[model samples]
Target chain A: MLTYGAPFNFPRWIDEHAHLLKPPVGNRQVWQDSDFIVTVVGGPNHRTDYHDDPLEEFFYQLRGNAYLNLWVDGRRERADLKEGDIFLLPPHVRHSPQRPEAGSACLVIERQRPAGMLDGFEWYCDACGHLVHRVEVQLKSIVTDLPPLFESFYASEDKRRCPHCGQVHPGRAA
Target chain B: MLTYGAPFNFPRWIDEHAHLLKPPVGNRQVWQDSDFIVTVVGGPNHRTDYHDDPLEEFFYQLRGNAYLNLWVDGRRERADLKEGDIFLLPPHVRHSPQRPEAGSACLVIERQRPAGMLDGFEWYCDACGHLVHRVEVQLKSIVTDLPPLFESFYASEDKRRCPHCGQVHPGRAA
Candidate 1:
């Protein structure tokens, strides 16, 4: 028997896969072995680092209003999207998607990463636009791989401190 | 310098490419040579035949509510989607998208068809569920290639008449 593709209803899937969308895990890969890497993300996301990748990522806002914060040529910009809006983020751009409202969700479509291409996660000083810390690594799975890196960055005071401005970057908790 | 991908905002693209989404042309392919064939479709679409493709098609409702009418086994079924909703359809399902509201729109993501595969546009008898006409053609572009077949089917009285029930399918205007 062959395994063909099946229908995916977002709300039902969100309800079924609630564990993957909760705390310590905010993303869930919707399909596997397909050309498009479809992901459903739920929020109040605590993402501080900008994702720098070599591939383009298409975004569709699903639940609540949110912002796609970006670092463009050393300046910060934001793209606001409410429910039903779609956005295509360019390759090599630094982007941080902010979804603060509870039950906020969005769809992020990305292509499979080619071999040897790494994804970067970098945080900038909140007070001054200075580089705080950076990590570049291959992501096996966003659900399984990204949380440890996030935990390590926020867990360490030294890594959270900005070398240029001496400002200690605060985590989500004040 | 290398050619990299650029950002795409839906409303801005809709405003810019209004010609592609008007009557006689309802779809616009967003990117070229990408893994996903991303299309922004504007509606009040006059689609009657069920599209039978070998690949899965993902649908995202962007503007108004619509129904994905499917021929499952022998019975007819429909999947309703409103704004901000997403549905992933299974492969080889005979599906007809009905979007009759003005200003209605959706995002359909499909994979590029493999070599030697043909897409089917089939119309069943409205009276007796008998097969009326089918065109299994290789689609070069949905925006360019599909309209002529649609026009030809509607123009001929012979093609619209059901062989089993002797019922004639009426055109949109009639």
Candidate 2:
């Protein structure tokens, strides 16, 4: 909506849009222009799919601690972002961020995905480390496009069942 | 250099390039691609001319307090940015940011100036409400291009002297 395209104050904006920081709508675009988008993401988020994208992502921890869980070279790793810290993730990295703290938030900046560039989401079996499901698409809207994909994966037990270890990958934590 | 294209951590980078934060070379690009550029600016800067540019500028105070003196409707106004404060300046506004504190620093984000878009610098008479000098050009590099312009202006007393009111604007504070 180009909300911060003009003169914008950060703390005032956060205070005003405090409701949007809650779960189920935990992310909001702070600035969007010149093919670059800056979004403030909050949590208690329950996302498990690793984002596979074709562009670099710059992250700045705004409120609290956030953990970026990465799957690299067939192993799991993590990068911690404490408050006021910053990180830039390279392109095509399979990474899923977990912000479990209730008031934890961060700012992420990424280039807008073009028509041919695809964004992939992959789920791994928590117990066996087998690839459970993978879907790739050009993401038009995170709100409109991503939720249904997660819903489809969580709704089907067949999709969550690990092919290698016979372990059913559970959905979001209860 | 695409120093931040890969996974980049801010505090580490800042620690590495801390020497560049001093005067005369007080600004360094953090990220630059897809027409967007992010620069970390430190001070005691001695810039007096108001910058008239065609793109929006987003500013975030990373260190001590800074003041943005703006010329709006023939009057001088200011925006104070304390540590952690943010302000997005609209396009084409005349602004001169003063970071007098030695350790004051800020993050500024702007788009790359295109071929036809001109960046302007304007200085006003200190005693009278008269324009001292104005120059407009396509800024190739802030370090390489801007310093020469300031040097030329300050070198000539005739340039700083107001034609309308016969008042000479003082150069940078000694």
Candidate 3:
């Protein structure tokens, strides 16, 4: 719970919470302030949706690589962020980060969106690339804001079904 | 040559300029704005002197390790920033970062120091850690700011020779 303008040794903190980032898709807060915030994110079974954060994001791969699959200007752009790579994402773009290794961690930094700004998590059908489900929210907490959005999408079979191709997505995020 | 507020990919840039962060200790710019600035710092062989900046710095090791030795609150603290570690430094702390490996790189972020703020580089005795020589300058460019300070200290054997122990420090920043 350290505030802004405080020094934190990241490796030490990560080491303490390494196990949590392992089994059940553990997530942990690093620090935050009025202008900017950071978190150490890991522990997901499946690659999820298009995250439409109003604020710009900076992702640095701390462990294994991840694919920054983005929907930008009506096209899909996939970039490989190997270990030690960084991606500074522009605002309003929808992106999905998928990690092949389950326990790999990433360091994420972003500005705190002001009042009236909206964030969204979306799913698209794998068979036909059709729109599936999108959850929009006024983000209150970075640490806990993501779990419910994932749960709702994963729990609904209708949402996983592609209306265009009659295909149902089989994977789920743990 | 991207301007401030423009998105930048750090690893992609580093790969294109791999030669710079190699034999000669190449440094490169990430981006900068009125409120904040970022740089990919890699090319310094020796920990030349204690760096004194008006602005606080956030350092994330992108590649190898670095020794962040600082003089803070009248005591010396040295931390190793291995790969994936980050350090958020406070303002006015005199510090030196020595990276042993030539190909290693670091990501540095800091605020734009307000007007009248100054930057400094100072030398302490190798034997007794007493103040030896000091240089203060308003840092205009991070890439070219500290070379002269290192040159002045290394050129003068008299300055390198500790008055307390009569031991002369060796060699230029290798």
Candidate 4:
């Protein structure tokens, strides 16, 4: 908790200094080294997108409620989170996080992105929920690469517009 | 999380069944790598002792209010805490947690106990507030090392009883 010889107050400090901390579903890394990684996303960005990661991604809700939509190894439906809810998703499993509008944050942990491993983005058909488009990229760095993907996805109507149900998903990155 | 070529698992099922996959805090561990460190003690400890650490000690109060009595390397007195509080005690600082009533808990995280790094525990007289006794040991494991120290301290009536005025410190190691 104490880092750089300074006080490390968690949610309180995180909540107070969010603007300067640089949040969203983007960067805001806490600790990232070759063997271990811990990242935090403060504030909301209307994040409702899935990532198919090449490595296990650990998750813990920090402040507000979170609705996580994902397909586990074999569950037929989504799991509603209860207290002590912490999970580590396996590589290549697709999942999307729907965070509460305000006062919400999540801490994610994983190992350093390995060589030859890739990160992904997928938009499904609004009508039939079929896979629409999937984008893949080698992770040069999570902080650097994360935001552009958001900008690129939100900017394109083609990605925002769902092909299955012919419905355009409302709202861009907040 | 899924384990195995596809899915070989244990607690994941129990967690899903409970709608609460109690992570390391409950069972006490996040990862068990050869050198990695993350262990959390759930129940309680004294308000009348000090810890001189070789590594930074981080805390998240899981239950009742806490009074963190500390000496931050240079100054005098203790840093204050609120009803709901968390802390990161820096290395080299001496500190102790005055816990709330029974049924409260705390989650502490720290780096692995490095080789040659030492951990110490010291008790102070209840009536006169003078140093009573001190214990030192190398921490081989948090889970394996932390609790019996508490019992040993509490079991010794001379340590639990203030020698200065023959005052008794209530509460045995639970």
lDDT for each residue of candidate 1 in B34-153, tens digit (9 for 90 to 100): 546788787767567889887777787767767877787678877776765777766678888887766777889886676788899988887898888888888667756887888888
- The candidate 2 chain A region of ten consecutive residues with least summed lDDT is A1-10
True contacts kept of 2: 0.26
- Lowest lDDT sum, 10 consecutive residues, model 1 chain A, at A1-10
C-alpha RMSD in Å of predicted model 1 compared with the true structure: 6.1
Give the lDDT of residue A1 in candidate 2: 21
Candidate 3 per-residue lDDT over residues B42-104, each given as its tens digit: 754666588887656778887877777777657777767787677766567788887777778
Candidate 4 chain A TM-score vs. reference chain A:
0.72
- Residue runs of model 4 more than 4 Å from their true location after superposition: A1-64, A74-79, A82-95, A100-145, A149-174, B2-44, B47-49, B52-56, B111-141, B148-174
Model 3 lDDT, residue A169, Cα? 63
Off by over 4 Å in 3: A1-16, A31-36, A82-85, A112-118, A122-140, A149-174, B1-19, B22-26, B30-38, B45-56, B62-65, B74-77, B80-85, B90-104, B110-174
Clashing residue pairs for model 3: A25-A43, B20-B26, B25-B43
Fraction of true inter-chain Cα contacts (below 8 Å) kept per model?
0.21, 0.26, 0.22, 0.13
lDDT of each: 0.75, 0.77, 0.69, 0.57
TM-score of chain B of 1: 0.87
Candidate 2 lDDT tens digits, B1-174: 223443455667776777887776887887545445678888878678989878777788877778888876668788787877876676777888888877777888776787999999989887876889998989777767888898888888889889998887886652
Highest DockQ model number: 2
Query: What lDDT does model 2 reach?
Result: 0.77
- Number of the top TM-score candidate: 2
Better of 1 and 4 by TM-score: 1
Cα error of candidate 1 at position A158, Å: 20
Worst 10 residues of 2 chain B by lDDT: B1-10
